[PDB]
Amino acid sequence: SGFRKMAFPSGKVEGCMVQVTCGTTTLNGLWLDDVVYCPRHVICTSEDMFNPNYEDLLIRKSNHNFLVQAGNVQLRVIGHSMQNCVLKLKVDTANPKTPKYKFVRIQPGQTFSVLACYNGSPSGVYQCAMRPNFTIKGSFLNGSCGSVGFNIDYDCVSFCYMHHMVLPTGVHAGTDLEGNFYGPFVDRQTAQAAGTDTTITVNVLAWLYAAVINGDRWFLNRFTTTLNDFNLVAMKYNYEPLTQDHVDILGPLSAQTGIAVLDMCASLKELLQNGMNGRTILGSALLEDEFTPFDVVRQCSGV
Amino acid sequence: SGFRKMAFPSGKVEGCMVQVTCGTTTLNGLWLDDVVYCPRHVICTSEDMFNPNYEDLLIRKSNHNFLVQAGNVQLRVIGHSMQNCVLKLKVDTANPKTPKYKFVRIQPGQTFSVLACYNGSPSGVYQCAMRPNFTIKGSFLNGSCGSVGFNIDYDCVSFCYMHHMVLPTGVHAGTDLEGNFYGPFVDRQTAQAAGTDTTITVNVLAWLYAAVINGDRWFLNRFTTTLNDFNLVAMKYNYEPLTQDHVDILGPLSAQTGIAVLDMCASLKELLQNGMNGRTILGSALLEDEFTPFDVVRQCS
Ligand SMILES: *[C@@](O)(CO)[C@H](C[C@@H]1CCNC1=O)NC(=O)[C@H](CC(C)C)NC(=O)c1cc2c(OC)cccc2[nH]1
Ligand SMILES: *[C@@](O)(CO)[C@H](C[C@@H]1CCNC1=O)NC(=O)[C@H](CC(C)C)NC(=O)c1cc2c(OC)cccc2[nH]1
Ligand SMILES: [Cl-]
């Protein structure tokens, strides 16, 4: 009963967050086994940040140049390497609270939980989606760098995002835990624009099924559409094309509600062409696209 | 800003969640020091649930009828009592993960994080607002009662909600950690209707202050009002009347922007009587009422 933007419980990640300081720069790090992972621009200065030759700046640093603090305990750095935009600080102590984990690179349209952290301390947790243009619409303030995004499957934490940047438009950019940015961004102190964003169509459809499962059907109609005719209209409105894989992934929700996927597409088509007028869906005046089919299934199955 | 619903990190509460079973009835409990708190209806059999006599059901129970488990590890129950709609089970082990905590009863409009749990295992965390009609718009499946709502201040967890009921309309109802329901509801297997809901005025005002902090201030007018005058008008638009506490918790935002609370109230009054006239505030044509003055500062600071 009910439907809400839900994040995974953050405890397993809270126990990995530490504070990393180099010179006058302080941000968050992720302590897994005997390594602390953080954004490499912590080794920058105020001047370096506009065009940093990271390899050149890193060689000039010593292990003792890195102050790592887990609570009221200082961790001794005994090694340091760089993997793309991620600094890897070897410490003399394995984190005793390390969970079962892996590093994964998430795909656009997929969701993850963000643990926002400042000075190594967790501050809040919320759910985000990888936008088609590889930005995320996060909530990050000064000092949030090194905050991580993750999913949980059973006891396994899959880390997928580390936070680096805010764009002039207010959306955010970061890397996976191998230090590769999502999108065309670069960890230099410059104003960067993203590619034109699109709406995550399969997620909007999942969310419409959620609204039906929660007893709201005002947007349904008797009509049906072909996949291609739907995609022509969606593309006109800057919606991502719906693939057959997307159609299949929506199977369960379609079965649960007995509304054919292409039947829901006809409803979305009508919503795009006419608008919602004054009405709302699941409390929103806008078409929500940051719930995946799985998000909806986990909250609405058997409901 | 980028105003999202943001929950508190849930780890301190995860370490307190257990499952409690009586017969085949299982739900969640909260293990703090050597006490486990849980909804008293765990002692009901499927059939008792329509109009239980809890005092009578409970006199027929002994400590050894209660199965409390942290994961798969049983915690022996050595004492039991009922306090309103909550059962308190004394166990022989003090929870080593017990945080600093208090039990607080919140006012309508206040927000809190809900850690949804099933069979003692946390599954998700999200932010809720206590509606003026004492419901919350949660996301709760079978097996969710005993899940708790909380705030975190410094290192201290303030527990404010324990889940008990879903209403016919799909909203949710529950108690504080002393077992006292929010609103007129009771822990019975019966359809219970919530009063008509109203908009949380104090939070709308917080949201307007947030808009002003962000340079979005077209709606400010050069008027002020009395609190009485505003309340009388607000009620005609199904808005909650403001209290002195509401005026007080808006103080920091009023000082930050230099706009007196009653001046902001006159601006809201004009929006109510005239509408948005096809404009948006913070990007939305809807006025948001689920961010408290604290949430605003917190997300902006
Ligand atoms: C990290 O905390 C830095 O350690 C920080 C996160 C942002 C601060 C405000 N909100 C955030 O998400 N990241 C930065 O400050 C990065 C640092 C780079 C990678 C060296 N830079 C930016 O986010 C950045 C720079 C510029 C800019 O130039 C100058 C112009 C416009 C936007 C912009 N963002
Ligand atoms: C707890 O998990 C029970 O342990 C459960 C929470 C709901 C399950 C689905 N979503 C929830 O939020 N609570 C209940 O089942 C309670 C049990 C009472 C306290 C004995 N009852 C209800 O939620 C309930 C019963 C009825 C009803 O009857 C008749 C008619 C309409 C609504 C309704 N809700
Ligand atoms: Cl039910």
Residue numbers in the entry:
A (entry chain A): 1 to 303
B (entry chain B): 1 to 301
Manuscript excerpt for this entry:
We determined the cocrystal structures of SARS-CoV-2 Mpro E166A, E166V, and E166V/L50F variants in complex with PF-00835231 to sub-1.9 Å resolution.
E166A/L50F and E166V/L50F variants demonstrated 10- and 950-fold potency loss, respectively. L50F has been reported to co-occur with E166 mutations to possibly compensate for the loss in enzymatic activity and therefore has been suggested as a background mutation that can accelerate resistance selection. However, in each of the inhibitor-bound Glu166 variant structures presented here, all three of these hydrogen bond interactions that define the S1 pocket are absent. Our structures of E166A, E166V, and E166V/L50F Mpro variants demonstrate two N-terminus hydrogen bonds absent in the WT complex: between Ser1:OG hydrogen and Phe140:O and between Ser1:OG hydrogen and the nitrogen atom of the γ-lactam ring. In the E166V and E166V/L50F variant structures, water molecules are positioned to substitute for the OE1 atom of Glu166, facilitating interactions with Phe140 and the inhibitor. The most resistant E166V and E166V/L50F had a Tm increase of a modest 3°C–4°C when nirmatrelvir-bound.
